[PDB]
RNA sequence: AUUCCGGUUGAUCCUGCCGGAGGCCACUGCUAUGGGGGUCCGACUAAGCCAUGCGAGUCAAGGGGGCGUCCCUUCUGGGACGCC
């Protein structure tokens, strides 16, 4: 219950500034599923700390890309660090973020904060021909997501099959809780930022697919926590 | 595993090729304790050329002969089984 007591400490010594922060602090909101699909803005990392306190674990925190960028000036070179990171719990909830700094540590901190701010909620299940089980071990059905030039299609896979995707998408899916999947990617996958954002968009798009009431039972669809 | 990674810029995103990464066959450096199973080993260039030995024989119950043994009447001539 270390994460639970961490959440209690945050809720104690946190002073809300936004409407959603006030809702959480006063107690109108108790479960993270309430802050989604309502149009609210998440601008305080303390909200995510309180509602998903496990995202602060190192095992649940993943730094994806570190890049050095240069600005030219009459004096010389101005170096800056761009860090692309991802956080989340290994059940339904994942987030991705970008941070910039004069130092790698500052960039990492800002990227983690922005990933927490951008956290989303996904849907999991099983819709593969070779599995036909009813567990949230893979994506419920085939989805697509594109960022820039990279197009990523995620397809359900049989239980026990590893994550057949690049390293970046593999880490993102592992943080999101998905365990088995097949992938088809087109475009420049070496662009880590675009690849990660395409995987993130593909995971998010699971909520854009209309489904029938019986499909939930058929595919074992689970929203957010399981 | 229905996968990616490095490389064009002071820095970025694309198109595009090259390389890395896996499997199979052929030649080859270094090195090598065993035992089993298999449809492996002068096909790639010369279906180019070959010393020597062997790789197609069998039948005496189709036929007449020769050499040897035996049984012999006994100069006669007859019968067999061995080899040719
Ligand atoms: Zn399944």
Swiss-Prot record:
Belongs to the universal ribosomal protein uS5 family. GO terms for molecular function: rRNA binding; structural constituent of ribosome. This is Small ribosomal subunit protein uS5. One of its GO terms (cellular component) is cytosolic small ribosomal subunit. The N-terminal domain interacts with the head of the 30S subunit; the C-terminal domain interacts with the body and contacts protein S4. The interaction surface between S4 and S5 is involved in control of translational fidelity. The keyword Ribosomal protein applies. Part of the 30S ribosomal subunit. Contacts protein S4. InterPro entries: Ribosomal_Su5_D2-typ_SF (IPR020568), Ribosomal_uS5 (IPR000851), Ribosomal_uS5_arc (IPR047866), Ribosomal_uS5_C (IPR005324), Ribosomal_uS5_euk/arc (IPR005711), Ribosomal_uS5_N (IPR013810), Ribosomal_uS5_N_CS (IPR018192), Ribsml_uS5_D2-typ_fold_subgr (IPR014721). GO terms for biological process: translation. With S4 and S12 plays an important role in translational accuracy. Keywords: Ribonucleoprotein, Ribosomal protein, RNA-binding, rRNA-binding. The gene is rps5. SUPFAM superfamilies: dsRNA-binding domain-like (SSF54768), Ribosomal protein S5 domain 2-like (SSF54211). Residues 59-122 form the S5 DRBM domain.
